[PDB]
Design a protein around this nucleic acid. Sequence first.
DNA 1: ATTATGACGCT
DNA 2: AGCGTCATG
Length: 430
Amino acid sequence: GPHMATGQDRVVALVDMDCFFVQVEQRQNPHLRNKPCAVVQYKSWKGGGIIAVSYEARAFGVTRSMWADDAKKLCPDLLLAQVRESRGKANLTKYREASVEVMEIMSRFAVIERASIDEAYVDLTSAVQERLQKLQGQPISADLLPSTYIEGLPQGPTVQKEGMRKQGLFQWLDSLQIDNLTSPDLQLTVGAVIVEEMRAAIERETGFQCSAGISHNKVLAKLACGLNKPNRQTLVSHGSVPQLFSQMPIRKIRSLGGKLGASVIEILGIEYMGELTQFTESQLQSHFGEKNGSWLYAMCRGIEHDPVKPRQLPKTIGCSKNFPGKTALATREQVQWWLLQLAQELEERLTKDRNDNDRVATQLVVSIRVQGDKRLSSLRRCCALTRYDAHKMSHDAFTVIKNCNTSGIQTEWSPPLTMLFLCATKFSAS
DNA sequence: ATTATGACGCT
DNA sequence: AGCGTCATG
Ligand SMILES: [Mg+2]
Ligand SMILES: [Mg+2]
Ligand SMILES: [Mg+2]
């Protein structure tokens, strides 16, 4: 009762750019705006692989991981933008730079954790305290929340989507106790006001729209963000969790979309995240381990403690290329030429990183895949990264992987390589 | 023949 | 250290 902590101590947002690479290309080329359009990598094989899709194109069933030729079957007027190619490979610099634009705006409002190229967690607890002290018991106007959904509302005693949104927001705001500076629901609401401001700033200053979730922890904020896309934000209160989770497939919660989630479903004979509440913490630990079990026990009650890490920059800088089927690398000359191309992109990005961010990577990780192995990586070997020099990096990479050549001949490479990956890691300030 | 990343856990 | 899992622009 009075001692059961409810995980309502923080205000956490998750901001996710809508169809991010598409928006980057639509900003650059206005002919693509407000059209079904997608971004593809490469072009020769089945038209290129789609990696981002505008919401107009999603209405036709176009999805990521679809070949552009197949997408064109669903969407004959689909417009396509291609990722830049440099040194024979896809080069994502434009999108990384656009991401930095967005991350720097977000960082004006609060500490952020860069969770991916297009999404960041925001710890708003402090900012909310500040804004609450400035409001001085002033109620919160619905006008301050023009794109906010309150998950679970309206309920009880309305034909159009915006009307529903406003009905729910009105129910929520009329129930609020703005006299209480420590009300978690009030804190979430002020958090949503700040996120409206953040999203307005991002769109004003970059052109890019985003969606966002506001809740008490990262998992709920991420879940919330997905509920109303695009260009909307969703507040998931602690009180909304039982109904929300009662029909939520386990695979929708971040980290449960893979093998672990499938085992939770199969071992416990459940489907929805709310069904987890009927197990003791010890039961969950016995099936899924101490860490997972404790996490599941709290998470199915809406409680999670994982902090928003203060980290706006990537921890690693990597370059990767697949060589599928017939294009696999079967000669030493091939392997060395591509190691060099990857190393040259890596050197460029590393030198820029050192200039922008006052750090140097100290470890080079070399990963390969060989023909036949169904794993992402067949082999991972690290070595010292002591100078930002592509020729040295490519030579060292060849050094750590050359023993994998089964071929008795010096010039041939067997089994041929279907993937090369160079990753710079272990940064130190400089 | 989706690809190209990136974070983090396990042992 | 090297491997595996999860996410998925
Ligand atoms: Mg996104
Ligand atoms: Mg994202
Ligand atoms: Mg996505």
